[PDB]
Design a protein around this ligand. Structure first.
Ligand SMILES: *[C@@H]1O[C@H](CO)[C@@H](O[C@@H]2O[C@H](CO)[C@@H](O[C@@H]3O[C@H](CO[C@H]4O[C@H](CO)[C@@H](O)[C@H](O)[C@@H]4O)[C@@H](O)[C@H](O[C@H]4O[C@H](CO)[C@@H](O)[C@H](O)[C@@H]4O)[C@@H]3O[C@@H]3OC[C@@H](O)[C@H](O)[C@H]3O)[C@H](O)[C@H]2NC(C)=O)[C@H](O[C@@H]2O[C@@H](C)[C@@H](O)[C@@H](O)[C@@H]2O)[C@H]1NC(C)=O
Ligand SMILES: *[C@@H]1O[C@H](CO)[C@@H](O[C@@H]2O[C@H](CO)[C@@H](O[C@@H]3O[C@H](CO[C@H]4O[C@H](CO)[C@@H](O)[C@H](O)[C@@H]4O)[C@@H](O)[C@H](O[C@H]4O[C@H](CO)[C@@H](O)[C@H](O)[C@@H]4O)[C@@H]3O[C@@H]3OC[C@@H](O)[C@H](O)[C@H]3O)[C@H](O)[C@H]2NC(C)=O)[C@H](O[C@@H]2O[C@@H](C)[C@@H](O)[C@@H](O)[C@@H]2O)[C@H]1NC(C)=O
Ligand SMILES: *[C@@H]1O[C@H](CO)[C@@H](O[C@@H]2O[C@H](CO)[C@@H](O[C@@H]3O[C@H](CO)[C@@H](O)[C@H](O)[C@@H]3O[C@@H]3OC[C@@H](O)[C@H](O)[C@H]3O)[C@H](O)[C@H]2NC(C)=O)[C@H](O[C@@H]2O[C@@H](C)[C@@H](O)[C@@H](O)[C@@H]2O)[C@H]1NC(C)=O
Ligand SMILES: *[C@@H]1O[C@H](CO)[C@@H](O[C@@H]2O[C@H](CO)[C@@H](O[C@@H]3O[C@H](CO)[C@@H](O)[C@H](O)[C@@H]3O[C@@H]3OC[C@@H](O)[C@H](O)[C@H]3O)[C@H](O)[C@H]2NC(C)=O)[C@H](O[C@@H]2O[C@@H](C)[C@@H](O)[C@@H](O)[C@@H]2O)[C@H]1NC(C)=O
Ligand SMILES: *[C@@H]1O[C@H](CO)[C@@H](O[C@@H]2O[C@H](CO)[C@@H](O)[C@H](O)[C@H]2NC(C)=O)[C@H](O)[C@H]1NC(C)=O
Ligand SMILES: *[C@@H]1O[C@H](CO)[C@@H](O[C@@H]2O[C@H](CO)[C@@H](O)[C@H](O)[C@H]2NC(C)=O)[C@H](O)[C@H]1NC(C)=O
Ligand SMILES: *[C@@H]1O[C@H](CO)[C@@H](O[C@@H]2O[C@H](CO)[C@@H](O)[C@H](O)[C@H]2NC(C)=O)[C@H](O)[C@H]1NC(C)=O
Ligand SMILES: *[C@@H]1O[C@H](CO)[C@@H](O[C@@H]2O[C@H](CO)[C@@H](O)[C@H](O)[C@H]2NC(C)=O)[C@H](O)[C@H]1NC(C)=O
Ligand SMILES: *[C@@H]1O[C@H](CO)[C@@H](O)[C@H](O)[C@H]1NC(C)=O
Ligand SMILES: *[C@@H]1O[C@H](CO)[C@@H](O)[C@H](O)[C@H]1NC(C)=O
Ligand SMILES: *[C@@H]1O[C@H](CO)[C@@H](O)[C@H](O)[C@H]1NC(C)=O
Ligand SMILES: *[C@@H]1O[C@H](CO)[C@@H](O)[C@H](O)[C@H]1NC(C)=O
Ligand SMILES: *[C@@H]1O[C@H](CO)[C@@H](O)[C@H](O)[C@H]1NC(C)=O
Ligand SMILES: *[C@@H]1O[C@H](CO)[C@@H](O)[C@H](O)[C@H]1NC(C)=O
Ligand SMILES: *[C@@H]1O[C@H](CO)[C@@H](O)[C@H](O)[C@H]1NC(C)=O
Ligand SMILES: *[C@@H]1O[C@H](CO)[C@@H](O)[C@H](O)[C@H]1NC(C)=O
Ligand SMILES: *[C@@H]1O[C@H](CO)[C@@H](O)[C@H](O)[C@H]1NC(C)=O
Ligand SMILES: *[C@@H]1O[C@H](CO)[C@@H](O)[C@H](O)[C@H]1NC(C)=O
Ligand SMILES: *[C@@H]1O[C@H](CO)[C@@H](O)[C@H](O)[C@H]1NC(C)=O
Ligand SMILES: *[C@@H]1O[C@H](CO)[C@@H](O)[C@H](O)[C@H]1NC(C)=O
Ligand SMILES: [Zn+2]
Lengths: 499, 499
């Protein structure tokens, strides 16, 4: 019988008690990255994260940081491989920058051979060290040209441009890459990119944020989400019809959270909690498992919710071999009004829920996850049991899928000096406590989880935060980015992997 | 009788001997800037100078600098006005960033109202201080979307997108702006952007520079130059047909140089010198004055030189009310082979000339202009008489045009400390020696020159050089960009203007 801790102090950093041998022999352990966050702009065209961070520097991070140079994995990809080799990792998730291989967006405009060569060399280097690549086609970095031609995922033109990009990736890299992710965190671009305008491309209703160049936060999230699902599904169909000889697997990436009632004896909070599951997870998992959006979304969102045709429904339903599930934290849910006629209405209001990290009796859900220095009542707290609850829910609700945990990690402040930054015991605690619950759910609930990739390989540009936080298991000096030095967490993870 | 110095030491920094009163009462004196170089990316979309500097950081400058934040004239435009007011300047040349007012490139995709407001406030502030705006529509910063959709000026689609952009500018700003420049330095994008790939977008033949993503240095410069002329001419026709009520004037910007024979008794060097005038100046001025390219270009370039239809010829011929002439330096010319079958052939080779700053007897043409620390035999030297020779030539060869000198200036090294940087006596010498010759040519040759704008108002991002050189008449601290402090040159220029 497995017992796992939910509160500080944690004792799962002892590899005598928790290590890779606790999991099945074939289980993959590694780390993750994304292209905007690590590569730099050298050698690629411009994408909407370049555009957004440059047009709206205060939205890029408090330091106005961006991905222009970052950790320079364009130059230092071998050093990334070296970290993975030091870890004895068996997996690495990275993304392909669309703008590096097709700078002009549309494949018929030509490819960048040198960009293709960059990923060939990375892939070959990984495989030579026994590391399985997990490759994200689209980690938010849409070529700027496509956003300017037709507003990107706002328009159905995205589907064929994404398909042709993906086809090039399968053609060039699929002989070696056997695990593909289509779109990173399906929920995020619709809501943050087109709802709150916290993320690229930065569209919203005028009264939500007067700096947005255009948008409608009530309608566009739904349009974009719908196009994401269709573009994803078209790529999965292309993969499974035209690249079956490659013997690989493909799936989407979800951001997952668990949700608990703010007041577990209040029917209204219980209802809000179940609505959140539907609106947060079901928005995408309903289509992916059934070809339809959840009924509560149909009912609430009404004419703002697009319909799938019968052909589209069939294309989207079942459009995965596995799910990449990202998991960071859990929220309490309580009811909230949905003012659909307000000029500041957002899609996110349609769930009719307010989310907190403290429940009605004043209980904080778990240890600190992210401090918010401008408003401490907005601090985020984590909840290790949430990974158990999410995986159990996916198994039970969503037809026992094959799952890889494609991100899980925690930040430390960029204000810490290097010695403090390397002494990242809070990261060991977060990672181990989640791994304990992941082992527990696999054993107790028989969830088909076959790997775990911690966020992040190394310090990088963090969307929305610049270089003001660090997520890496290895440390990068922003004054001299060449080295990636394993932190205490990376050293712990090395021991966990090879105990 | 006016006597002007050609060699150090110069004594024209004495405003007792040379000042604004030496020129006609109406003559405009000011300074110049461009949008990529000064504004920053905040509040605008991405353009090909963002793309180029980010994809090819070693081509942005030795420091890998770029226009992301620069002097932040987005925030500090009032401080630019303040410099101009301190100078008692009567003119200011600035550019509109296309990506700030139409981030999606094509006008039908929507405009950025806040971008429009930015230029309205600048323009209104200038006029309130008695400063005449000279506004460049296109200072190289093409929206990235257009380059990615159709490769920008490589394709005739540029013409209508440029026209619709210009129409928006005339509509929004032409009630106040009475001097418009279409395209900055017509020669530069074809040759550097599409020939040598030193400049955005960075296209060339594969053996010219293997880093180029695509291109053909032998053909594309000509295509791009042809489209520039057509796009320019379509905008001038639009202006003069639809905006005549505004009572303003429009013209192109030329980069001018003079050319002297490397050996003034050698017929081959004399011939190369005359070819250079045709290939450098006539490439554009032939079309602008006659609707045809120079015969030597027709003959040499052959099938690589596009033809104008009779309608196009008529549109381009006479498509200016004035010329903005930029002038920095003069070169000696000697013959050079034109290897049209070589895989590394460039359009620039078609002139059949090699350019130097030292003549056959070892004479350097004038004082140092720009030191090249990697190769000192590649140092640039200036030649004050060249402004006289250029203006005389334009009057005689090109039908006595109205001229404004739209740039003239010199750099100092970014390695200098602030006190050295503010003690910019080399800049006084360059500016005064050229102003002396400009007065001389107006008086002696009756060239219709009606203003002079020195490059640059303040230190900025220099194309190709990052922040490794400074051109400003006012100093900017890159650690805190708010202030623009007049250098010795700016203080001199203040006295020259109001002696
Ligand atoms: C998994 O996918 C299944 C589909 O493959 C989902 O089942 C569908 O659920 C639909 C409701 O979401 C349901 O459709 C309703 O059908 C009513 C019956 O119509 C038939 O008989 C009519 C009925 O009197 C007639 O007009 C129709 O022409 C048919 O003959 C119908 O009125 C409904 O329309 C009203 O409600 C929708 C909102 O739900 C409004 O958008 C619409 O304007 C109208 O106001 C609805 O019809 C659907 O209307 C929209 C139109 O685009 C669709 O094509 C039309 O179908 C449908 O019958 C079933 N299909 C079957 C095969 O069962 C299933 O939903 C879950 O299970 C069903 C039983 C129900 O409990 C749902 O609430 C659950 O979500 C999906 N499962 C999951 C887990 O999501
Ligand atoms: C200012 O613009 C003026 C035009 O408005 C320029 O004058 C034109 O100069 C053209 C040469 O560049 C000249 O065209 C040549 O015409 C030859 C005569 O053709 C007529 O009689 C024929 C002759 O036997 C017959 O086939 C034609 O159908 C006509 O009836 C002719 O062969 C020439 O073609 C050969 O040379 C061109 C290269 O120059 C090759 O491209 C072509 O394949 C061929 O090998 C040339 O014809 C032009 O051919 C190209 C085609 O696209 C053009 O439409 C065709 O016209 C033309 O006659 C005159 N036009 C007039 C009205 O004078 C003027 O040029 C300068 O002055 C002229 C006198 C000459 O000295 C030029 O070298 C100078 O540049 C321009 N001025 C300046 C300063 O540039
Ligand atoms: C978790 O949710 C539960 C369920 O909602 C909360 O308990 C409910 O709390 C209500 C007060 O917020 C209680 O109603 C009140 O009852 C007193 C005594 O009769 C009365 O004077 C009030 O006016 C009020 O009555 C309601 O007024 C509004 C009418 O529309 C409605 O019909 C009336 O019910 C309610 O009885 C209680 N329900 C239960 C089943 O206990 C619970 O609140 C926490 O516990 C209750 C017992 C009370 O001590 C609250 O102070 C305390 O906050 C909530 N838990 C937390 C931690 O918020
Ligand atoms: C400025 O250009 C002028 C004109 O080209 C240069 O003068 C010419 O310089 C040529 C040498 O580069 C002289 O030709 C040579 O004459 C000597 C004496 O006969 C002879 O032994 C050589 O072989 C050579 O003759 C040529 O060989 C190649 C044959 O195809 C050709 O037919 C022969 O001419 C040439 O006479 C001279 N022309 C004139 C009109 O003087 C001039 O060069 C400079 O001055 C000359 C006089 C000489 O002192 C050169 O050393 C010196 O460089 C050049 N000025 C500069 C500074 O480069
Ligand atoms: C978001 O787009 C929706 C749909 O176009 C706009 O909502 C509508 O508003 C028009 C004008 O009021 C209404 O007549 C419709 O009844 C509404 N339709 C629905 C589906 O709600 C909403 O004004 C736009 N919001 C913003 C801020 O522009
Ligand atoms: C807030 O969260 C706390 C902690 O999960 C809940 O408290 C638990 O309540 C259960 C059922 O009453 C008790 O058995 C436990 O002993 C309590 N745990 C502790 C740490 O207090 C609490 O019920 C939640 N409040 C609401 C209103 O939902
Ligand atoms: C530049 O484009 C020119 C024109 O397409 C290419 O030049 C031609 O080369 C083809 C193949 O040799 C030739 O048959 C033609 O005779 C040439 N045409 C002319 C007008 O010169 C040139 O190969 C291309 N250069 C590069 C590096 O791709
Ligand atoms: C190189 O440039 C120098 C300077 O312009 C030329 O020298 C002048 O030559 C003229 C005509 O012979 C003499 O009258 C001057 O006195 C010379 N000036 C000085 C400063 O020497 C020289 O002729 C040029 N060389 C060539 C080969 O063209
Ligand atoms: C691995 O952890 C298991 C408990 O899951 C433990 O029994 C085993 O001895 C540990 N391995 C090492 C080498 O410490
Ligand atoms: C940040 O930038 C936007 C312009 O993009 C401006 O609207 C907003 O006021 C600025 N935010 C703060 C908090 O200053
Ligand atoms: C598959 O490849 C063939 C060859 O390009 C193409 O005809 C077919 O449409 C593609 N298939 C998809 C997505 O099924
Ligand atoms: C607009 O929304 C903000 C945040 O969503 C809220 O605090 C404010 O009350 C809203 N105003 C109206 C008019 O509803
Ligand atoms: C930068 O870091 C690398 C790796 O530690 C080191 O070899 C190189 O010398 C350092 N550069 C400077 C300028 O210190
Ligand atoms: C790498 O992991 C394999 C598999 O568990 C193990 O056999 C090998 O010893 C490990 N190597 C190192 C250096 O830890
Ligand atoms: C201006 O320069 C002229 C010579 O061009 C001179 O005569 C005049 O006195 C100077 N003005 C002043 C105020 O020094
Ligand atoms: C600069 O960058 C390019 C890649 O864009 C590379 O091809 C070239 O070798 C580098 N230049 C130098 C001098 O290192
Ligand atoms: C002028 O404006 C009118 C109204 O848009 C348009 O019909 C006409 O084509 C434009 N003219 C140009 C470039 O001449
Ligand atoms: C190619 O050109 C470079 C510079 O243009 C030159 O130095 C080299 O000799 C040329 N090579 C050939 C094959 O002509
Ligand atoms: C930056 O420069 C401005 C103008 O001199 C000054 O007022 C401001 O205090 C300076 N900021 C810092 C942080 O020194
Ligand atoms: C501004 O220039 C005008 C025109 O020459 C002159 O009358 C006025 O005195 C000058 N002002 C200053 C402060 O120099
Ligand atoms: Zn940047």
């Amino acid at each position: 019988e497995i017992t796992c801790q939910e509160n500080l102090p944690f004792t799962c950093g002892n590899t005598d008690a928790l290590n890779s041998s606790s999991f099945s022999s074939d289980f993959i352990f590694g780390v993750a990255s994304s292209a905007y966050q690590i590569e730099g702009t050298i050698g690629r065209g411009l994408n909407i994260w370049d555009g957004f961070t440059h047009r709206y520097p205060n939205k890029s991070g408090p330091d106005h940081g961006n991905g222009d140079t970052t950790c320079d994995s364009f130059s230092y990809w071998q050093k990334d491989i070296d970290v993975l080799d030091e870890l004895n990792a068996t997996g690495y998730r990275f993304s392909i920058a669309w703008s590096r291989i097709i700078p002009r967006g549309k494949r018929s405009r030509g490819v960048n051979e040198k960009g293709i060569d960059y990923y060939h060399g990375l892939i070959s280097g990984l495989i030579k060290k026994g590391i399985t690549p997990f490759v994200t086609l689209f980690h938010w970095d849409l070529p700027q040209t496509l956003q300017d031609e037709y507003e990107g995922f706002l328009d159905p033109q995205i589907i064929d441009d994404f398909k042709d990009y993906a086809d090039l990736c399968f053609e060039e890299f699929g002989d070696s890459v056997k695990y593909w992710l289509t779109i990173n965190q399906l929920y995020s671009v619709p809501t943050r990119g087109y709802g709150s305008a916290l993320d690229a491309p930065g569209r919203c209703s005028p009264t939500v944020d007067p700096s947005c160049y255009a948008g409608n936060s009530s309608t566009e999230p739904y349009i974009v989400a719908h196009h994401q699902l269709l573009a994803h599904a078209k790529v999965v169909d292309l993969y499974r019809k035209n690249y079956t000889h490659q013997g690989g697997k493909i799936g989407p990436t979800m951001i997952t959270r668990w949700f608990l009632p703010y007041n577990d004896t209040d029917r209204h909070s219980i209802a809000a909690t179940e609505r959140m599951k539907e609106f947060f997870l079901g928005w995408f998992m309903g289509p992916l498992t059934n070809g339809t959006y959840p009924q509560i979304m149909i009912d609430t969102v009404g004419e703002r919710l697009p319909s799938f045709s019968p052909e589209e429904s069939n294309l989207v339903k079942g459009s995965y071999d596995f799910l990449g599930l990202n998991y960071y934290f859990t929220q309490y849910a309580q009811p909230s009004p949905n003012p659909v006629n307000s000029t500041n209405h957002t899609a996110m209001m349609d769930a009719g829920a307010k989310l907190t990290y403290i429940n009605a009796s004043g209980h904080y859900i778990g240890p600190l996850f992210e401090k918010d220095k401008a408003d401490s009542t907005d601090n985020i707290y984590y909840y290790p049991k949430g990974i158990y609850s999410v995986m159990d829910y996916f198994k039970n609700k969503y037809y026992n899928p094959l799952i890889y945990v494609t991100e899980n990690g925690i930040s430390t402040p960029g204000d810490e000096n290097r010695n403090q930054s390397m002494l990242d015991y809070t990261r060991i605690d977060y990672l181990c406590s989640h791994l304990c619950f992941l082992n527990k759910v696999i054993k107790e609930k028989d969830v088909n989880v076959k790997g775990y990739l911690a966020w992040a390989l190394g310090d990088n540009y963090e969307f929305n935060k610049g270089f003001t936080v660090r997520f890496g298991l290895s440390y990068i000096d922003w004054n001299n980015v060449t080295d990636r030095d394993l932190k205490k967490s990376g050293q712990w993870y090395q021991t966990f992997i090879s105990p």
